[PDB]
Amino acid sequence: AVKVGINGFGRIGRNVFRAALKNPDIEVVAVNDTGGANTLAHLLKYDSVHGRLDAEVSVNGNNLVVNGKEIIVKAERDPENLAWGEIGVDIVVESTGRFTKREDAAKHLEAGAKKVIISAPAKNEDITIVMGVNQDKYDPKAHHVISNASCTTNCLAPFAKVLHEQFGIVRGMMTTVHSYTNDQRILDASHKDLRRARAAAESIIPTTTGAAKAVALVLPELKGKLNGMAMRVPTPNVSVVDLVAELEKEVTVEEVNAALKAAAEGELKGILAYSEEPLVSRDYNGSTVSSTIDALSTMVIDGKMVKVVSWYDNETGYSHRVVDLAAYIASKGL
Amino acid sequence: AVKVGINGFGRIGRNVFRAALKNPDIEVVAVNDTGGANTLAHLLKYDSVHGRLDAEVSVNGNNLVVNGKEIIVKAERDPENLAWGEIGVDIVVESTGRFTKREDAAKHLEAGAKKVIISAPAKNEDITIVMGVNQDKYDPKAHHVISNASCTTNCLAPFAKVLHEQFGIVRGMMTTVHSYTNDQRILDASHKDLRRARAAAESIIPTTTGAAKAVALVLPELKGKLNGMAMRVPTPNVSVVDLVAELEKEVTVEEVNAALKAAAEGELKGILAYSEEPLVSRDYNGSTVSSTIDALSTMVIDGKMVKVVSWYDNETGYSHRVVDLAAYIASKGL
Amino acid sequence: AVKVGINGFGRIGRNVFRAALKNPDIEVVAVNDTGGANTLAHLLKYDSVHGRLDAEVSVNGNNLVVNGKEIIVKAERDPENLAWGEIGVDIVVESTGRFTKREDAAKHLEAGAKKVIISAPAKNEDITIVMGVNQDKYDPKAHHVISNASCTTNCLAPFAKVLHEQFGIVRGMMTTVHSYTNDQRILDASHKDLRRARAAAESIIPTTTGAAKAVALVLPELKGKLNGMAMRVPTPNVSVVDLVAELEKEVTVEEVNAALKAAAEGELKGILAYSEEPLVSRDYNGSTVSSTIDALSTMVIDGKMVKVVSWYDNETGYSHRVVDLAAYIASKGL
Amino acid sequence: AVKVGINGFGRIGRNVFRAALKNPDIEVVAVNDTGGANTLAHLLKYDSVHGRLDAEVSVNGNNLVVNGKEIIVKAERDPENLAWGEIGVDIVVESTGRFTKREDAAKHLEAGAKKVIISAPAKNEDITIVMGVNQDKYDPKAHHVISNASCTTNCLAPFAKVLHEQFGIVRGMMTTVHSYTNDQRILDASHKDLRRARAAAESIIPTTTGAAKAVALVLPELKGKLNGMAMRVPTPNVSVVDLVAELEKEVTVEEVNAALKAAAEGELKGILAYSEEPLVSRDYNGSTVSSTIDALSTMVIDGKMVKVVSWYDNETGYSHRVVDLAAYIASKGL
Ligand SMILES: NC(=O)c1ccc[n+]([C@@H]2O[C@H](COP(=O)([O-])OP(=O)(O)OC[C@H]3O[C@@H](n4cnc5c(N)ncnc54)[C@H](O)[C@@H]3O)[C@@H](O)[C@H]2O)c1
Ligand SMILES: NC(=O)c1ccc[n+]([C@@H]2O[C@H](COP(=O)([O-])OP(=O)(O)OC[C@H]3O[C@@H](n4cnc5c(N)ncnc54)[C@H](O)[C@@H]3O)[C@@H](O)[C@H]2O)c1
Ligand SMILES: NC(=O)c1ccc[n+]([C@@H]2O[C@H](COP(=O)([O-])OP(=O)(O)OC[C@H]3O[C@@H](n4cnc5c(N)ncnc54)[C@H](O)[C@@H]3O)[C@@H](O)[C@H]2O)c1
Ligand SMILES: NC(=O)c1ccc[n+]([C@@H]2O[C@H](COP(=O)([O-])OP(=O)(O)OC[C@H]3O[C@@H](n4cnc5c(N)ncnc54)[C@H](O)[C@@H]3O)[C@@H](O)[C@H]2O)c1
């Protein structure tokens, strides 16, 4: 139904596409990137991380074709030159990683979009939503530049409000052992971040993250209670959040675990999941959910300090969320 | 000066040997392993992680020759056939990972040895020592079979000691993002631990650790206050401990890093090091210290909860304490 | 239909079990390994390389259950104790890597089986066969202990047969850039081959291969015209064969490739494949054929020296051929 | 002694520096890069492949201070605004990887430099030289923009010269299993080459090379007689060349090895190396020669078709050649 256009057909841009391939409620009609249609078609069809695209992929001049549907390929390095209105695009997915400041994202509105979704933490955005935590706070007539936050945050928010609603978080620290992304370097090179300037596939890399405190944007009640860091390791995909929290109540591992298992099958069904199996990162490559609790890992100390570990496919889970936000936003009418 | 024997010329036994080549107080007169002399000489000469040994290594007859000294090479799969007494070996390093029970390790004393150092946490050992934390409690009369603990406990114990001495640890949880070891599997194959059964270089593999609990064998007060887990990632060496604790008194990062820094410059010098550089895992490959504090990563929340991330080369650092402890043992009188 | 047994539920074993799930002609009734039903069930459904099994895996007693079919699990380290006869097993896939000698594998025939397929190069086998090259030389009366050869010989035979019957080979060299396997070490350790002693995921490891000379066993007139080498690199699966051969006839790239493509579409369909695409190794992960010609790599020098580069999933393509061989054997008579 | 300037302090630039510190004949006085001084003083000191620089690296304003000596750090993206003359730079190493064409690399000459060495193959350069095979063809009067070829041509030519002079190379094909470099992608992303567009640390990536055709530039005797390709694989540094050629004469494995060894000890000492140890790639990380023969791999079929394998540290070997070339040029009187 709703027509979508993607700006930056990259790891998140093509996976959002693959995700949207299914959902007939939305319709990807155009993509924009610095590459040629012939390159974008190849990278869309063969993925080193998720395999082959099961669909018919081809080029019609300078236009993509996938299962009959022809997709428009644009190449404006400047969003203002996009002409969304012309082609009739309603919602635009801003996944270049270059336009997360309102000042660059709003161009899409001026060019004729109705709404804009930023697949990363934005600046001066109208609102930040984590499907499962605050999508209910989306005002159609007031919010147009929308941020879907970061993958880590989408992973941590769901199980944080659940421990908070039932036991109440006093404070907590989080680490994310995360897979390397295209923002790091193959071999040693310059990066605004001297950590990320180091060969990504050779070391464990300490780095910062805004995910933990940015949780207060979706769950205000937790403002100033969390903080955290990250560590990039030698795997191309899949991450795991590690949270240690000081609880307001005395629990047992069996209590902390039943809570999450309840919400995962209840309120949070489809976004939050639960597992009692001893799985490893490769096992989660393809997981469309945001957060998967590893029950075998839950621990409690003195009945008041808890450790909850949760998995998350940083490209797929996150890619299915962008598409879920698109449809939600859409259903509220543009 | 005092003769030493190495049982199990593995990552740990060869590494302790390199360390020991530069220690005037000890002297490795013989090594026992299932492998032959050529193989052992080649693996001693070329190391994929630590590089080529700066020494002249050869195989004369059945014995290794290193810089003139001739090392005795055995192949007795049974500790009591070793005859350490015949050659006059006083301290025997047990690094096969098979003899971790006092009784099994006691077999070296049977054979002529006076002291046995197990390069691993043990079962009913005489005393467990973490250089810098409790080697003072070593009695030359009552203790014969000593455990040097694990590489993780050696990294955590020293800074927990300082945080508890200065601020007081109410309780804490830990996580060691550890490199893979020989105990893991190249590709999916049988294994006691179903997590460790999976390909080591392919995934982020959550697993267990006794390190956190084991701290108490060296730091009594913290009994029941620490706990933690392990995450083995695709790096071949160098690991990192991540401690999140609730302190007694309200601290600030400045206080936390200052107390650590000071302890690193005095009492704990040589064992505990402090770094304010934005470094990564490859950088500590070859460190002799048991724990280098990542000061840039220190953080606190609500003035009572801190996070302290520390580095430790698992092979080299630990190897240097085995040699350290053995020489401390030799000084106490045998 | 045919009842089948597997000895050694490892990399080839579990993969042959997965391939046989498609085959109608055979049926795997019992498996034997050192690992128990519970571990065997886990590793079966969860694979770091091939994914989650898309079937229902359950365990009952010491048996497995996949899609309602109870499979029998044994743990006889000695082959003559399996008793294939009491359970109707006609075919036995020898994949432990231990019983390659005709005299050991023959233990299965002493157990009640009628045919044994050794998943590897053999010593004294009745006949060695590469499907598509010489399956026709199989005599159901004379051959009981068949060698299916190596994954490398299966990749190389099919197009060496074409190049030879087509243009004529005089002499050639081959190198297989190959993924690491379970015969190597995670971290620097003892091994008969001092090259396979080095940390597998860390280096480019040169090693020997008999795959070149083994091709004369099934392509007789190629006796002494070939030889080659191997180089294990840091990828968990999928390999490539690089063949430089001097021909009898003058040729051109265009002709060399036309000859391969034709066979891929006629003669060797299912065994041989042709690729015009600039894909990489991870893209062939799951390829069922034995060899896919990277047609973009074919080269000619002085119109007599050729270079053909073929890809092959060492685990998948091989396994399917094990299933095929089994089904063929059953078709000629049993 | 001879003042040298580096344009582009990347992988080859930083290494060329490190090597330069050993030679007093040259003195690196200036370096140009897009990255800041503080970022360069970090990447220089800490290296994920080659470890820490054994030196005092400091920052002064926006210049480097290394072992007392201050280096002027420039930041001009355009080579014509570099002013190499105002600072006394005689020789300029062009290692940005973007100025491989005369019209661009000439700008340094117009800017004040006397000689230019391009750290890669070039187009329309005054002359292309591989040390030890044709540096005598240098004309200090006619040659100013000098190409130092690639790391591969550097490895392959000196021994190709030996084999050809000695036995006679009718024709031959080559393959270089090569470590990944900074021209690749960490994760599937746009690239001119769709092979290099794929996730670098995850696959075997067949790619192109001109190395084979380039030998002819330095050994015209071998024009149209060689050709080859590249296999980029998941290691961070150190590569290997696999040459398979035809000979006019009939040799034996010993016949060929005696000659490579002889050459290594005679005419080609320092440039070519010979080895009888079963080493692996990490064993060559740090090597300063351009070519080390894996003598355990020489193969001969019929006495006419030979296979020779040679290792090469692509970063270090090449950079010591660059420093060397800068010494020869100077030696002739700029
Ligand atoms: N990779 C992950 O796991 C992940 C997950 C969630 C969010 N994100 C966020 O998604 C955004 C994109 O990240 P990515 O990981 O996909 O990186 P990426 O490099 O794959 O994607 C960038 C895409 O943007 C294109 N591009 C950049 N500027 C362009 C321009 N001006 N015009 C046209 N095309 C342009 C690039 O060609 C590329 O194809 C970032 O904000 C990132 O923080 C990444
Ligand atoms: N490697 C590290 O990162 C690390 C750190 C600290 C402690 N440890 C502990 O050190 C011990 C050894 O571990 P490692 O990591 O070096 O493993 P490893 O597998 O490299 O070494 C085992 C050595 O003992 C040999 N061996 C086995 N049985 C023997 C026998 N019966 N007689 C003589 N020699 C025999 C093996 O061949 C091998 O050389 C274990 O207890 C381990 O848990 C490991
Ligand atoms: N993986 C490949 O690429 C590949 C390809 C072709 C041929 N092969 C060959 O087939 C054989 C299997 O190799 P793999 O790669 O599957 O190895 P693997 O290590 O994954 O499997 C070996 C298995 O045999 C079991 N086993 C060993 N001895 C046993 C015994 N005596 N009784 C019962 N079970 C036993 C082990 O528990 C293990 O699961 C080897 O000969 C190998 O060289 C492997
Ligand atoms: N990596 C090796 O093994 C190797 C070996 C032989 C030849 N080469 C060639 O050497 C050259 C350098 O390759 P690399 O591997 O060092 O890559 P690199 O990216 O690590 O280094 C290139 C440096 O030049 C800088 N640079 C780019 N444009 C610049 C500009 N306009 N002005 C100033 N500085 C600029 C970049 O920021 C970077 O630091 C390339 O031609 C490469 O192909 C590399």
Short mmCIF file of N, CA and C in Angstrom, two decimals, chain D residues 20-110:
data_model
loop_
_atom_site.label_atom_id
_atom_site.label_comp_id
_atom_site.label_asym_id
_atom_site.label_seq_id
_atom_site.Cartn_x
_atom_site.Cartn_y
_atom_site.Cartn_z
N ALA D 20 62.93 3.41 6.90
CA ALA D 20 63.83 4.54 6.71
C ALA D 20 64.68 4.81 7.92
N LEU D 21 64.10 4.62 9.11
CA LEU D 21 64.78 4.84 10.41
C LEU D 21 66.04 3.99 10.62
N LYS D 22 66.22 3.01 9.75
CA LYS D 22 67.36 2.14 9.84
C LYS D 22 68.47 2.63 8.92
N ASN D 23 68.10 3.31 7.84
CA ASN D 23 69.10 3.81 6.89
C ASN D 23 69.50 5.27 7.09
N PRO D 24 70.78 5.52 7.34
CA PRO D 24 71.23 6.90 7.53
C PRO D 24 71.42 7.65 6.21
N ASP D 25 71.57 6.89 5.12
CA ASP D 25 71.76 7.47 3.78
C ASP D 25 70.60 8.40 3.39
N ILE D 26 69.40 8.12 3.88
CA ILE D 26 68.21 8.93 3.60
C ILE D 26 67.68 9.47 4.91
N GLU D 27 66.90 10.55 4.83
CA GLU D 27 66.31 11.20 6.00
C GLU D 27 64.91 11.71 5.64
N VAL D 28 63.87 11.09 6.22
CA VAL D 28 62.50 11.52 5.97
C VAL D 28 62.26 12.79 6.76
N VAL D 29 62.06 13.88 6.03
CA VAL D 29 61.87 15.17 6.66
C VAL D 29 60.44 15.69 6.59
N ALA D 30 59.63 15.15 5.68
CA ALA D 30 58.25 15.62 5.54
C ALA D 30 57.26 14.54 5.13
N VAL D 31 56.00 14.69 5.53
CA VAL D 31 55.00 13.71 5.13
C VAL D 31 53.69 14.45 4.94
N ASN D 32 52.93 14.04 3.94
CA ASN D 32 51.66 14.67 3.67
C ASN D 32 50.52 13.68 3.79
N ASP D 33 49.44 14.09 4.46
CA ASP D 33 48.27 13.23 4.62
C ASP D 33 47.03 14.03 4.98
N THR D 34 45.88 13.46 4.65
CA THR D 34 44.60 14.07 4.93
C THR D 34 44.37 14.04 6.44
N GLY D 35 44.92 13.02 7.10
CA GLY D 35 44.75 12.86 8.54
C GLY D 35 45.61 13.78 9.40
N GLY D 36 45.12 14.11 10.59
CA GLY D 36 45.84 14.99 11.48
C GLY D 36 47.12 14.46 12.10
N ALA D 37 47.95 15.37 12.61
CA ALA D 37 49.22 15.01 13.24
C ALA D 37 49.00 14.01 14.35
N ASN D 38 48.11 14.33 15.29
CA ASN D 38 47.81 13.44 16.43
C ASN D 38 47.30 12.05 16.03
N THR D 39 46.59 11.99 14.91
CA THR D 39 46.09 10.74 14.37
C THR D 39 47.25 9.95 13.77
N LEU D 40 48.20 10.64 13.15
CA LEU D 40 49.36 10.01 12.53
C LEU D 40 50.39 9.53 13.56
N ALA D 41 50.59 10.31 14.62
CA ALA D 41 51.52 9.93 15.68
C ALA D 41 51.00 8.71 16.42
N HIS D 42 49.71 8.43 16.29
CA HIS D 42 49.12 7.27 16.93
C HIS D 42 49.29 6.07 16.01
N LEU D 43 48.80 6.18 14.78
CA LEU D 43 48.91 5.09 13.82
C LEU D 43 50.35 4.68 13.51
N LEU D 44 51.30 5.57 13.80
CA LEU D 44 52.72 5.28 13.55
C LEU D 44 53.28 4.42 14.67
N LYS D 45 52.93 4.79 15.90
CA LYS D 45 53.40 4.11 17.09
C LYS D 45 52.79 2.72 17.28
N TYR D 46 51.48 2.61 17.09
CA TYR D 46 50.79 1.33 17.27
C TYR D 46 50.40 0.76 15.94
N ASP D 47 50.76 -0.50 15.69
CA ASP D 47 50.47 -1.13 14.41
C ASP D 47 49.90 -2.55 14.69
N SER D 48 48.68 -2.80 14.21
CA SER D 48 48.02 -4.09 14.38
C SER D 48 48.78 -5.27 13.76
N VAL D 49 49.63 -5.02 12.77
CA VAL D 49 50.40 -6.11 12.15
C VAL D 49 51.86 -6.11 12.58
N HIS D 50 52.47 -4.93 12.65
CA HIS D 50 53.89 -4.88 12.98
C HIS D 50 54.26 -4.44 14.38
N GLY D 51 53.27 -4.38 15.27
CA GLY D 51 53.57 -3.99 16.64
C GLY D 51 53.87 -2.52 16.87
N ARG D 52 54.41 -2.22 18.04
CA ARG D 52 54.73 -0.86 18.42
C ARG D 52 56.05 -0.43 17.87
N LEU D 53 56.12 0.81 17.40
CA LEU D 53 57.37 1.31 16.90
C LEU D 53 58.29 1.49 18.10
N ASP D 54 59.48 0.91 18.03
CA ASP D 54 60.49 1.05 19.09
C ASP D 54 61.11 2.45 18.98
N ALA D 55 60.35 3.49 19.31
CA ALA D 55 60.86 4.86 19.24
C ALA D 55 59.98 5.84 20.00
N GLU D 56 60.52 7.04 20.26
CA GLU D 56 59.79 8.11 20.95
C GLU D 56 59.02 8.93 19.92
N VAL D 57 57.71 8.69 19.77
CA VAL D 57 56.86 9.42 18.81
C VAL D 57 56.07 10.53 19.52
N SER D 58 56.25 11.77 19.09
CA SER D 58 55.56 12.88 19.74
C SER D 58 54.98 13.86 18.73
N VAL D 59 54.15 14.79 19.24
CA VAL D 59 53.49 15.81 18.42
C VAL D 59 53.89 17.20 18.92
N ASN D 60 54.26 18.07 17.99
CA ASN D 60 54.64 19.44 18.32
C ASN D 60 53.90 20.41 17.42
N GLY D 61 52.83 20.97 17.96
CA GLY D 61 52.01 21.88 17.18
C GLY D 61 51.33 20.92 16.25
N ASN D 62 51.78 20.89 15.00
CA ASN D 62 51.22 19.96 14.05
C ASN D 62 52.33 19.27 13.27
N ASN D 63 53.39 18.90 13.99
CA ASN D 63 54.53 18.20 13.40
C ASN D 63 54.84 17.00 14.27
N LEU D 64 55.57 16.04 13.71
CA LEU D 64 55.94 14.83 14.44
C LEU D 64 57.33 15.01 14.98
N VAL D 65 57.61 14.36 16.09
CA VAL D 65 58.94 14.39 16.68
C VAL D 65 59.16 12.91 16.95
N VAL D 66 60.16 12.34 16.30
CA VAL D 66 60.47 10.93 16.45
C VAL D 66 61.98 10.84 16.65
N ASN D 67 62.33 10.43 17.88
CA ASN D 67 63.72 10.30 18.33
C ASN D 67 64.43 11.64 18.17
N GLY D 68 63.78 12.66 18.72
CA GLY D 68 64.32 14.01 18.66
C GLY D 68 63.98 14.78 17.40
N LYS D 69 64.18 14.18 16.25
CA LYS D 69 63.93 14.83 14.97
C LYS D 69 62.47 15.18 14.70
N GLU D 70 62.22 16.43 14.34
CA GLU D 70 60.85 16.85 14.03
C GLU D 70 60.59 16.69 12.53
N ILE D 71 59.40 16.23 12.18
CA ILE D 71 59.01 15.98 10.79
C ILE D 71 57.86 16.96 10.47
N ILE D 72 57.95 17.65 9.35
CA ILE D 72 56.89 18.57 9.00
C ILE D 72 55.73 17.76 8.44
N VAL D 73 54.57 17.95 9.04
CA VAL D 73 53.36 17.24 8.65
C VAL D 73 52.49 18.17 7.82
N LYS D 74 52.35 17.84 6.55
CA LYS D 74 51.54 18.64 5.67
C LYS D 74 50.18 18.00 5.51
N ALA D 75 49.24 18.80 5.02
CA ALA D 75 47.87 18.35 4.82
C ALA D 75 47.26 19.00 3.59
N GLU D 76 47.85 18.72 2.43
CA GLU D 76 47.37 19.25 1.16
C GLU D 76 46.86 18.05 0.35
N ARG D 77 45.60 18.11 -0.08
CA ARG D 77 45.03 17.03 -0.88
C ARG D 77 45.53 17.14 -2.33
N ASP D 78 45.95 18.35 -2.70
CA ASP D 78 46.44 18.63 -4.04
C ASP D 78 47.96 18.74 -4.02
N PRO D 79 48.64 17.81 -4.72
CA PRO D 79 50.09 17.68 -4.87
C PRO D 79 50.84 18.91 -5.38
N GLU D 80 50.17 19.77 -6.14
CA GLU D 80 50.83 20.97 -6.67
C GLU D 80 51.03 22.06 -5.59
N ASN D 81 50.26 21.99 -4.51
CA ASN D 81 50.36 22.97 -3.44
C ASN D 81 51.16 22.39 -2.28
N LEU D 82 52.05 21.45 -2.57
CA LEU D 82 52.86 20.83 -1.54
C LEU D 82 54.17 21.55 -1.18
N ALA D 83 54.74 22.31 -2.11
CA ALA D 83 55.98 23.06 -1.85
C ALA D 83 57.18 22.25 -1.38
N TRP D 84 57.32 21.03 -1.88
CA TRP D 84 58.44 20.18 -1.47
C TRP D 84 59.78 20.90 -1.45
N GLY D 85 59.91 21.92 -2.30
CA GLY D 85 61.14 22.69 -2.41
C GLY D 85 61.42 23.62 -1.25
N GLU D 86 60.39 24.29 -0.77
CA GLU D 86 60.53 25.22 0.35
C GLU D 86 61.10 24.51 1.57
N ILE D 87 60.94 23.19 1.59
CA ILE D 87 61.43 22.39 2.70
C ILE D 87 62.64 21.49 2.41
N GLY D 88 63.17 21.55 1.19
CA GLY D 88 64.36 20.78 0.85
C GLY D 88 64.22 19.31 0.47
N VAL D 89 63.00 18.86 0.19
CA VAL D 89 62.77 17.47 -0.19
C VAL D 89 63.33 17.15 -1.58
N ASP D 90 64.28 16.21 -1.63
CA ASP D 90 64.92 15.77 -2.88
C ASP D 90 64.13 14.65 -3.57
N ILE D 91 63.82 13.60 -2.80
CA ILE D 91 63.06 12.46 -3.32
C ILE D 91 61.71 12.41 -2.66
N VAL D 92 60.70 12.08 -3.44
CA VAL D 92 59.35 12.02 -2.93
C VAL D 92 58.76 10.65 -3.21
N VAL D 93 58.27 9.99 -2.17
CA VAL D 93 57.64 8.71 -2.37
C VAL D 93 56.15 9.03 -2.50
N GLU D 94 55.57 8.58 -3.59
CA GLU D 94 54.16 8.77 -3.88
C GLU D 94 53.40 7.49 -3.53
N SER D 95 52.84 7.45 -2.31
CA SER D 95 52.10 6.27 -1.78
C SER D 95 50.62 6.48 -1.35
N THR D 96 49.95 7.45 -1.96
CA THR D 96 48.56 7.75 -1.64
C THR D 96 47.69 6.73 -2.34
N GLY D 97 48.20 6.25 -3.47
CA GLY D 97 47.51 5.28 -4.31
C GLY D 97 46.58 5.97 -5.28
N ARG D 98 46.65 7.30 -5.34
CA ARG D 98 45.77 8.07 -6.20
C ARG D 98 46.50 8.83 -7.25
N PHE D 99 47.83 8.88 -7.16
CA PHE D 99 48.60 9.62 -8.15
C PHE D 99 49.58 8.74 -8.93
N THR D 100 49.05 7.67 -9.51
CA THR D 100 49.82 6.70 -10.29
C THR D 100 50.05 7.10 -11.76
N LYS D 101 49.52 8.24 -12.16
CA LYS D 101 49.66 8.71 -13.53
C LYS D 101 50.58 9.90 -13.56
N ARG D 102 51.45 9.92 -14.57
CA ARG D 102 52.44 10.98 -14.80
C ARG D 102 51.93 12.40 -14.58
N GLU D 103 50.85 12.79 -15.25
CA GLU D 103 50.30 14.14 -15.07
C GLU D 103 50.05 14.55 -13.60
N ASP D 104 49.86 13.56 -12.74
CA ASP D 104 49.62 13.79 -11.33
C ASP D 104 50.88 13.69 -10.49
N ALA D 105 51.62 12.59 -10.65
CA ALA D 105 52.86 12.40 -9.91
C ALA D 105 53.95 13.41 -10.33
N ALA D 106 53.78 14.01 -11.50
CA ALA D 106 54.72 15.01 -12.01
C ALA D 106 54.64 16.25 -11.12
N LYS D 107 53.42 16.61 -10.72
CA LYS D 107 53.19 17.77 -9.87
C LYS D 107 54.20 17.92 -8.75
N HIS D 108 54.73 16.82 -8.23
CA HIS D 108 55.73 16.92 -7.16
C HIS D 108 56.98 17.55 -7.71
N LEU D 109 57.36 17.14 -8.93
CA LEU D 109 58.55 17.67 -9.59
C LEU D 109 58.37 19.17 -9.81
N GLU D 110 57.20 19.54 -10.34
CA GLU D 110 56.86 20.94 -10.59
C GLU D 110 56.87 21.67 -9.27
#
